[PDB]
Amino acid sequence: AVPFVEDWRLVQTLGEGAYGEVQLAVNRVTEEAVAVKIVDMKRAVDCPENIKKEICINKMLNHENVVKFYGHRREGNIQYLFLEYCSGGELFDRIEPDIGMPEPDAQRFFHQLMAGVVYLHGIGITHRDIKPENLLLDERDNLKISDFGLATVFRYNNRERLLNKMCGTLPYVAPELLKRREFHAEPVDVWSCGIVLTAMLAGELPWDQPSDSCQEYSDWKEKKTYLNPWKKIDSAPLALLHKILVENPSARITIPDIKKDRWYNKPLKK
Ligand SMILES: Nc1ncnc2c1ncn2[C@@H]1O[C@H](COP(=O)(O)OP(=O)(O)OP(O)(O)=S)[C@@H](O)[C@H]1O
Ligand SMILES: [Mg+2]
Ligand SMILES: [Mg+2]
């Protein structure tokens, strides 16, 4: 019944977005540390209903590789979302530009990413904006899928919904999102995970946009893998990427089969 600021000390700005801010908050009596996403519902006409949907999706989630939702408050136009504080920051900041990261680290992050995406898809949720900026790390560098503001239900009461809305981030979106009027949700998340893995192993994104207009994408379809970023990627993970970054979503590898992939299961040393 008392104000947010009387219970919570904002200690640190963690991130700044167009529609909200994320603060590290410390409870003034408990001293427990929390991430609070502060959202001014004045900044968009349908933000009230968009943030309500984000909260309803968050309340369905409970997995070690998904940022945990603790609750929410409203104070006038302000919505507070309390989330698991991820001390380790963004996966994005572990990706050295043009370099990437050690293959064992990339593999480990990929394992954890798959675990979270499998969980989400199992409860019928698609994230729709998977990228290193939305994959956070806890104090033990465990990966946690973050930000469900673009997430939606693709399976409900055992019936699948095809998607028809364009959203996400252009270097990470699957080509069917640019070309088809309707598309299945799961292969889109699979595709973006493959871009994430490409970024982890090479430190760069392969194309602006998986368009016929984009030469980098056409060179990939012609498997000119002597070019960058592919030449930086060992043939074993590259064989997996060849199975993920497949244009036709009906032929694209599914996660159950990613789990059977040689590199996925290859023991790696430092
Ligand atoms: N739970 C968290 N723990 C630690 N850091 C976080 C957490 N949530 C967000 N951040 C940081 O805040 C940044 C932005 O938060 P997001 O939720 O991704 O905001 P955004 O989507 O960029 O902003 P808008 O308003 O949706 S355009 C992230 O990239 C993290 O660096
Ligand atoms: Mg985000
Ligand atoms: Mg967001």
Side-chain angles (χ1 to χ4, degrees), residues 100-120:
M101 68 178 67
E103 198 171 297
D105 296 299
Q107 196 201 44
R108 174 181 174 284
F109 289 135
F110 195 70
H111 288 159
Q112 299 181 341
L113 174 63
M114 286 303 100
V117 170
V118 166
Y119 171 79
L120 293 177

Side-chain angles (χ1 to χ4, degrees), residues 145-184:
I145 300 163
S146 170
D147 192 358
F148 293 83
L150 284 184
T152 198
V153 174
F154 79 89
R155 196 197 307 113
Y156 203 78
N157 291 332
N158 211 8
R159 288 298 306 256
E160 177 178 6
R161 271 166 201 62
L162 296 166
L163 305 177
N164 71 308
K165 297 289 197 334
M166 261 195 248
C167 69
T169 301
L170 275 169
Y172 298 84
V173 308
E176 64 267 31
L177 195 136
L178 307 182
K179 291 153 222 221
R180 308 287 232 302
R181 294 210 332 299
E182 288 189 287
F183 51 89
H184 289 273

Side-chain angles (χ1 to χ4, degrees), residues 1-8 27 36-39 41 51 55 69-82:
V2 316
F4 163 88
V5 296
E6 179 149 0
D7 286 329
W8 296 100
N27 194 280
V36 186
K37 188 154 69 181
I38 303 162
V39 177
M41 291 183 290
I51 201 75
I55 289 158
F69 177 74
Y70 294 137
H72 59 117
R73 291 187 55 166
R74 190 209 318 145
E75 283 182 346
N77 308 317
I78 306 314
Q79 202 72 246
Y80 305 90
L81 277 71
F82 301 75

